[PDB]
């Protein structure tokens, strides 16, 4: 079994990369693709609070992402790993660190402590960081506030990334991003 997370800002080609890598890995491994809340009822109820209300305090939002993360881990990820599956997870602890910790300004260390409570030692075995420049990312997506937030997210990921992390150059055409990500994963799985 293996727990592999995928991280990156918007415009990194993360959705395409995970889907293509899943279609290639399924030939040789029992693999599943997931994201939080991923159908877990409690996580889905939390997601409705976050989305359908109520122009939220950033710390309350961080705690709700962390609570959805725990429910998804306990009810979906852990049982799949017990069946010997390769779990491909779109966003995990690092997204809370970059978005809530860095970009939203709570502080990475405060958000880290919150997330360590939520995951209780269950760190990914491997984390693919889709390293896109802000400029290429901006082009893949298509105001000043959105652009600045996109840049801060990238800045946050850079601070976080500085052992389980494997940075893939996401400025390349997507076929190459897919190939580099697939090769990184197979090297880890076959080791
Ligand atoms: C995992 C994670 C992600 N993001 C960002 C990434 C970029 C998109 N952002 C907006 C965004 C976009 C779509 C949705 C939707 O799913 O439709 C959405 O909602 C939820 C997503 C995941 C979990 C929950 C639940 F509430 F359940 F925790 C709600 C939020 C969310 C953080 O900021 N921190 C984190 O930890």
From Swiss-Prot:
Tree of life domain: Bacteria
Binding site for ATP: 8-15
GO cellular component: cytosol
EC number, UniProt record: 2.7.4.9
Catalytic activity: dTMP + ATP = dTDP + ADP
UniProt xrefs under InterPro entries: P-loop_NTPase (IPR027417), Thymidylate_kin-like_dom (IPR039430), Thymidylate_kin_CS (IPR018095), Thymidylate_kinase (IPR018094)
Parts forming coiled coils: none
Disulfide topology: none
GO-annotated biological processes: dTDP biosynthetic process; dTTP biosynthetic process; dUDP biosynthetic process
Keywords linked to the UniProt accession: ATP-binding, Kinase, Nucleotide biosynthesis, Nucleotide-binding, Transferase
Gene3D superfamilies attached to this UniProt entry: P-loop containing nucleotide triphosphate hydrolases
GO molecular function: ATP binding; dTMP kinase activity
Family the UniProt entry places it in: Belongs to the thymidylate kinase family.
Main function: Phosphorylation of dTMP to form dTDP in both de novo and salvage pathways of dTTP synthesis.
This protein's name: Thymidylate kinase
Upper classification of the organism: Bacteria, Bacillati, Bacillota, Bacilli, Bacillales
């Amino acid at each position: 079994s293996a727990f592999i997370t995928f991280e990156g800002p918007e415009g990194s080609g993360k959705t395409t990369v995970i889907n293509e890598v899943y279609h290639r890995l399924v030939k040789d491994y029992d693999v599943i693709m997931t994201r939080e809340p991923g159908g877990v009822p409690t996580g889905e109820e939390i997601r409705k609070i976050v989305l359908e209300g109520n122009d939220m305090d950033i710390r309350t939002e961080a705690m709700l992402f962390a609570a959805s993360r725990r429910e998804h881990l306990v009810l979906k990820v852990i049982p799949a790993l017990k069946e010997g599956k390769v779990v491909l997870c779109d966003r995990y602890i690092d997204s809370s660190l970059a978005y809530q910790g860095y970009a939203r300004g709570i502080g990475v260390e405060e958000v880290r402590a919150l997330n360590e409570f939520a995951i209780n030692g269950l760190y990914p075995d491997l984390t693919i960081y889709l390293n896109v420049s802000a400029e290429v990312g901006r082009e893949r997506i298509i105001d000043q506030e959105d652009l600045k937030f996109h840049e801060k997210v990238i800045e946050g990921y850079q601070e976080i990334i500085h052992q389980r992390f494997k940075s893939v150059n996401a400025d390349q055409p997507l076929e190459n991003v897919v190939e580099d990500t697939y090769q990184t994963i197979i090297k880890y799985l076959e080791k």
